[PDB]
Amino acid sequence: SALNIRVGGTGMFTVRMALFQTPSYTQPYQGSSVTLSTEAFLYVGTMLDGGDLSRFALLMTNCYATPSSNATDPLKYFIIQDRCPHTRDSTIQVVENGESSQGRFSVQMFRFAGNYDLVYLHCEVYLCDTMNEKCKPTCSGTRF
Amino acid sequence: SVEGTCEECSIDEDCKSNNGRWHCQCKQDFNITDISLLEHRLECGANDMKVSLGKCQLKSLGFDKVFMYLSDSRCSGFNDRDNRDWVSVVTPARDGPCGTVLTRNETHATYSNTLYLADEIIIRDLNIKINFACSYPLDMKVSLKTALQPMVSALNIRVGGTGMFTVRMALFQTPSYTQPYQGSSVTLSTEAFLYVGTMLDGGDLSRFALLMTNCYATPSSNATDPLKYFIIQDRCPHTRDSTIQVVENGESSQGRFSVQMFRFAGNYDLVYLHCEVYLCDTMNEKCKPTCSGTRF
Amino acid sequence: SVEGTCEECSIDEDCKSNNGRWHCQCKQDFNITDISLLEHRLECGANDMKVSLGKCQLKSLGFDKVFMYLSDSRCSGFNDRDNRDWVSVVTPARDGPCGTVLTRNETHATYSNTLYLADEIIIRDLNIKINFACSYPLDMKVSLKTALQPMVS
Ligand SMILES: *[C@@H]1O[C@H](CO)[C@@H](O[C@@H]2O[C@H](CO)[C@@H](O[C@@H]3O[C@H](CO[C@H]4O[C@H](CO)[C@@H](O)[C@H](O)[C@@H]4O)[C@@H](O)[C@H](O[C@H]4O[C@H](CO)[C@@H](O[C@@H]5O[C@H](CO)[C@@H](O)[C@H](O)[C@H]5NC(C)=O)[C@H](O)[C@@H]4O[C@@H]4O[C@H](CO)[C@@H](O[C@@H]5O[C@H](CO)[C@H](O)[C@H](O)[C@H]5O)[C@H](O)[C@H]4NC(C)=O)[C@@H]3O)[C@H](O)[C@H]2NC(C)=O)[C@H](O)[C@H]1NC(C)=O
Ligand SMILES: *[C@@H]1O[C@H](CO)[C@@H](O[C@@H]2O[C@H](CO)[C@@H](O[C@@H]3O[C@H](CO[C@H]4O[C@H](CO)[C@@H](O)[C@H](O)[C@@H]4O)[C@@H](O)[C@H](O[C@H]4O[C@H](CO)[C@@H](O[C@@H]5O[C@H](CO)[C@@H](O)[C@H](O)[C@H]5NC(C)=O)[C@H](O)[C@@H]4O[C@@H]4O[C@H](CO)[C@@H](O[C@@H]5O[C@H](CO)[C@H](O)[C@H](O)[C@H]5O)[C@H](O)[C@H]4NC(C)=O)[C@@H]3O)[C@H](O)[C@H]2NC(C)=O)[C@H](O)[C@H]1NC(C)=O
Ligand SMILES: *[C@@H]1O[C@H](CO)[C@@H](O[C@@H]2O[C@H](CO)[C@@H](O)[C@H](O)[C@H]2NC(C)=O)[C@H](O)[C@H]1NC(C)=O
Ligand SMILES: *[C@@H]1O[C@H](CO)[C@@H](O[C@@H]2O[C@H](CO)[C@@H](O)[C@H](O)[C@H]2NC(C)=O)[C@H](O)[C@H]1NC(C)=O
Ligand SMILES: *[C@@H]1O[C@H](CO)[C@@H](O)[C@H](O)[C@H]1NC(C)=O
Ligand SMILES: *[C@@H]1O[C@H](CO)[C@@H](O)[C@H](O)[C@H]1NC(C)=O
């Protein structure tokens, strides 16, 4: 004879992203703010500080910039749109996405038009199981 | 009396200090059996999952020695070593080690594993296995903390534009200031009272008030005429004429002055009305002029 | 040849009528880059202030799409809708709405606000902000138009 009692616990993985300077993705920043020029290339990468399962891959469902820290802002400049980079901008190139836990997107700096002085970066990400999904998105031009 | 005072024993474990008697024992807080069987706590970590039970509860339930096992016996329980009341075990949050499995659906993944409890190696009467699971969301919001302050080469060119507010005044008939006139000319008698008011047809800012710096009448339309009969002199009405009364001036955009009719002395048949006005900012100036008799 | 003749296109926008070819395009009048960057016009209203630029000039400067913003983004540019050549925006002549401020001195008040220009949401090379201001006199002459004809015995 055995007694079974159900127990459940809500949890949360750890996810973070870093701003690298070099094209080799070497040194993260540590200051609360940085200064840059338009010609400077903004190299950024994402990482999992925990749960680095080999079969969980990092897929950028969409990334965007915002003038303010608050993510829910109407003024969004999608840099990655629904698993693919935004076209009509040659400076947007992603070396790796979905291959492994190290997701990096490269783009050169921009400024919001208006009185907005500060620019923030936000992203949404979907962990992909390599067992079932290919997790290597492929795309081309839109409807036209 | 190996230890002189209470600090050796746990804060949760109450210490009975007495002459000739010393020990620390639980209280009603961790006392009962059934709810203790219902008692537990869980913690889902980023890379590990922990389950723990109160050692006092286990001792009260008769389990002087506590044996905690999972689906894989290589995992064994041990003391909390952070808060001594609990006893806890750890499981890496993966599939394959310690017997843990991966339950996945479209929304978010989940990890499930079982905890086995017993007083000894063998189980005689009851075999309670605690089935626990942690849910890890598969979609989550992430924000880059470090903001950016880009630099751009901007061109500044100055531009200026001369403008003009709109100002007008009206001749009302009634003391209530109700109907303006529309004809190019009017006819009146001396006994008739001439009620007039001024208005801003635009720019009705709440902090801009209307102040009559001076008002005067002229026999002709041309303002620059030597023959002026000042009705309001330097922000105040002209004295020595009881018929000159102003209900409001500087209070708001509606400036009204009341005076009964007059005629210029001479061949002058027509009389005109002109005024000068200063818009007053309520933030700084009181804009409520006050005055009395002159030098004497 | 959807439209038979020239009247559809703007008077300022010259219409090229030809057999087998039809369109309307600008001329030397609105052609150059630098002076066009120097080109503008302003209008100070009783209760509103307007700034506008020639749409042809913007098209010639490569800004196929025109984004006009002020110190407050709730204010957005739009077509003139009176003379189609211009594109203009409006600002109420007060302090607080649309980010406008009030600069005041003893002689007369002044209103200052900034206009931001760009081809898209982001700015890459040049960020030109047009600083404009209107001066409203604080003392002015007012004359009652309707004269009077009093009667006396
Ligand atoms: C992908 O996968 C994920 C998970 O991996 C899915 O998301 C998960 O879905 C489950 C199921 O909905 C979620 O669990 C549920 O949580 C409920 C509470 O959630 C809130 O409170 C939490 C408190 O900590 C909080 O953390 C959380 O964030 C929420 O805010 C919980 O109430 C649910 O329990 C009910 O359902 C259980 C399973 O059916 C049931 O267990 C069984 O119960 C019977 C009954 O005795 C027992 O015999 C069985 O032994 C036992 N175990 C089994 C079957 O295995 C519970 O008992 C409980 O049953 C319902 O619960 C109702 C309320 O929840 C009660 O409603 C009351 O009813 C009264 C009348 O009877 C009155 O009308 C009263 O007004 C009314 O409120 C019922 O009474 C009661 N039954 C009975 C008979 O009384 C459940 O555990 C889980 O949280 C969620 N994941 C996350 C992260 O949140 C996702 O959907 C999947 N997606 C896809 C696409 O597949
Ligand atoms: C209360 O507040 C009100 C306003 O709110 C005050 O009244 C206002 O005062 C200002 C200042 O005087 C007035 O603006 C001035 O208008 C001048 C023209 O005005 C007439 O023409 C207008 C044309 O439309 C017309 O509408 C108007 O009614 C008048 O008829 C204008 O010329 C003035 O510009 C000079 O000053 C600018 C500010 O210093 C300066 O801007 C800077 O310039 C430098 C130089 O390159 C640049 O680097 C800066 O980026 C730029 N911007 C800044 C500093 O912010 C202009 O460039 C310009 O500079 C002078 O201008 C002189 C003539 O104005 C030139 O003189 C020539 O010089 C030559 C030698 O160099 C020869 O000698 C030549 O013969 C000679 O003519 C200078 O050359 C030039 N500098 C250089 C280096 O070349 C100014 O904008 C405003 O109009 C007025 N308000 C109203 C409603 O009229 C009031 O006073 C306040 N009162 C109190 C009590 O506080
Ligand atoms: C656990 O519960 C028992 C319940 O019996 C507690 O014993 C009671 O202790 C209080 C102390 O003031 C007495 O007044 C009651 O008369 C006792 N109960 C009975 C039935 O006699 C006991 O103290 C609780 N704590 C522990 C550690 O056992
Ligand atoms: C804008 O300026 C250019 C200047 O090149 C104009 O092109 C000239 O057009 C005339 C038309 O008779 C020719 O004679 C010139 O030879 C042209 N210039 C050159 C350098 O070849 C153009 O027409 C102007 N207007 C527009 C709308 O572009
Ligand atoms: C973010 O903005 C939305 C709407 O723009 C608002 O409802 C929400 O409260 C804001 N949150 C923060 C933290 O600013
Ligand atoms: C008004 O009168 C002055 C002098 O009396 C004269 O210089 C001016 O030209 C006159 N203007 C009109 C419009 O009559």
Author numbering:
A (entry chain B): 444 to 587
B (entry chain A): 292 to 587
C (entry chain C): 292 to 444
Direct quotes from the study:
These protect against urinary tract infections by binding to uropathogenic E. coli (UPEC), reduce nephrolithiasis, and are involved in the regulation of water/electrolyte balance and kidney innate immunity.
In agreement with the observation that the two types of structures occasionally interconvert within individual filaments, helical reconstruction of UMODfl showed that these apparently distinct conformations in fact correspond to different views of a single type of filament with 62.5 Å axial rise and 180° twist. Lower map resolution outside the filament core and lack of close structural homologues precluded accurate modeling of D8C. By combining this information with the refined coordinates of EGF IV + ZP, we could assemble a complete filament model consistent with both the tree and zig‐zag views of UMODfl.
